[PDB]
């Protein structure tokens, strides 16, 4: 147990890894999953929320009491709301008015202010409004898809944690779903330096396969599929791409909750499905690692766990 800390943000990181036992068999490589939902705010985005705020503070771009703005309907909004409450900043989020009352409660519980944009305009409307508010009011905009502090934090924290966790082993493949691409890029850089023969694999939705050269399209893999190539994604880091369908990912998440006791979001199901595909190709005795970005409890009102 960690010694007492003065601020909840000091427990971000240091997340555990579990070996899968039942959804993959002994004829395939071993598959390990890093539980990023064990971060105190509930997802991998705790890491980047903290890093972007702390970098802007260290650079004098913001100081406690300042207001930040970000367009987000996902875990980055929760992460920034959480970190802003913990560090004494004011958070404003733009998002389409389709957001549920429970999610509004969650962000407002941390004291965030919401600016709702037209539902039919989806993310484009929220992004435009955030830029307008930044220019009108001077709010700081973290810019999760361009801010180098995002992949950098994974290079400094997530990746070196994996090196410590896998001392005495070599990792043969690391796979991660791409939202901003910061996890894949920062972890991938660290792991490729330590294990130069590793394969790095990007995961994206089959229904929106932009990294594969396809066009954006509607998809249900929460956390993935931004519809463009983020600046925070190093497109040279990955050796291959695995596309995952909406139904395949949901079926995997359900199996993993029931058969491993690991209750994770649909993007975690996509990651595990892809890791199992890779494990079958590499065979017994090899080591495959992936990241589970968020917990299934955050998605009980989606089809994911509706039986």
């Amino acid at each position: 147990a960690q010694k007492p800390v003065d601020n909840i943000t000091q427990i971000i990181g240091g997340t555990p890894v579990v070996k899968l036992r039942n959804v993959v068999d002994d004829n395939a490589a071993d598959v390990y999953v890093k539980l990023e939902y064990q971060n105190p705010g509930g997802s991998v985005k705790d890491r980047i929320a903290l890093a972007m705020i702390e970098k802007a503070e260290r650079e004098g771009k913001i100081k406690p009491g300042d207001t930040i703005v970000e367009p987000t309907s996902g875990n980055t909004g929760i992460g920034l709301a959480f970190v802003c409450a913990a560090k004494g900043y004011k958070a404003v989020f733009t998002m389409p008015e389709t957001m549920s009352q429970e999610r509004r409660n969650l962000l407002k519980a941390y004291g965030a202010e919401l600016v709702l944009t037209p539902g039919s305009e989806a993310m484009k409307g929220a992004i435009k409004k955030a830029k307008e508010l930044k220019e009108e009011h001077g709010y700081f905009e973290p810019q999760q898809f361009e801010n180098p502090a995002n992949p950098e934090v994974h290079e400094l924290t997530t990746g070196p944690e994996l090196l410590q966790q896998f001392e005495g082993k070599t990792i043969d493949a690391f796979l991660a779903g791409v939202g901003t691409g910061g996890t894949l890029s920062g972890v991938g850089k660290v792991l490729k330096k330590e294990y130069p023969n590793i394969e790095i694999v990007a995961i994206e939705p089959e229904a929106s396969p932009v990294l594969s050269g396809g066009e954006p399209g509607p998809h249900k893999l929460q956390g993935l599929g931004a519809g463009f190539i983020p600046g925070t994604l190093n497109t040279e880091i990955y050796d291959s791409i695995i596309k995952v369908g909406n139904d395949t990912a949901m079926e995997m998440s359900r199996r993993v909750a029931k058969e491993e006791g690991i209750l994770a979001g649909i993007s975690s199901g996509a990651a595990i499905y892809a890791a199992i595909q890779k494990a079958k190709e590499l065979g017994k005795g090899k080591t495959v690692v992936t990241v589970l970005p968020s917990n299934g409890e955050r998605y009980l009102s989606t089809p994911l766990y509706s039986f």
Partner: peptide
């Protein structure tokens, strides 16, 4: 109209 949750 494109939506993502990031």
């Amino acid at each position: 109209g494109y939506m993502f949750y990031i």
